[PDB]
Amino acid sequence: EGALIRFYVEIEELIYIDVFTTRPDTVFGATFVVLAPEHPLVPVLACIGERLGNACYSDVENFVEKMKKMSTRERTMEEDKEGVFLGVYATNPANGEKIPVWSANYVLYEYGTGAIMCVPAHDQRDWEFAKKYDLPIKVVVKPEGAWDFEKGAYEGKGTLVNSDGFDGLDSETAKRKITEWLQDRGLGEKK
Structure with missing residues (x-):
């Protein structure tokens, strides 16, 4: 089993989105956040979005x-x-970049927290969504062989890139050390 990761929403009131993932090694590659349609924060964030003229x-x-x-x-x-x-946008706890919050059909309320971080480069389901809505592909687990990310997501093991000080680490090792890093900063949790 993986990890819980915390995404603070960049707004006036203190709201965060906890996300369950089996791939904490890919957190620097998170380019957007997706809530299940039934997720209780969907209407809440949507209203905030509208008042700012954004939704x-x-x-x-x-x-x-x-x-x-x-x-x-x-x-x-x-x-x-x-x-x-x-x-609205949430803050990626790893790099501190703002990433857009969406709601989508393919994310079920039943699994995890009913909310996911989206890594199109490394999850095919997220890749398809990003293809449809032109959301960015950011490679963070580089495979050893050649791979065309413009043609599909790579979901296997590799070596970290575009990942701050975790670069060069193998991805299975990186899971623990990124989790431990976030947990020590109170932005993540082992599961």
Whole structure:
């Protein structure tokens, strides 16, 4: 089992999004955050988004409503990636960059915290979503062989790049040391 990682939302009130991942080694590659449609923070962040003129609250409420009637088999296996921008950004705890918060069909409320960090370079499901919505691919687990990230996500083991002081470390070793690093900063937790 992996780790819990904390993403503070860049707004006036103190709100954070805990995310469960089996790949804490890829945290520097997180380019956006996705909440399940049923996730209690979706309407909350959406309203904040709108007041800042960054989202349409009714439009988000329409997404949630439509997605509640739909079924698991249809949501993540039959229907193409569908999602809405919430109008807010969260802070990647590893690098401190702001990343956009979205809600999407393919993330189920049942698994983990019902909220995920998205690493398109290294998770195919996230790759498809980023392809549809033009969200960035950021390689952090470089494979040894040649790989075209413009054609697909690489989900295997490798050596860290674009990852601050964790560069050059092998990815399975990096999981522990990045977790321990975040845990010591109160921004992550071992599971």
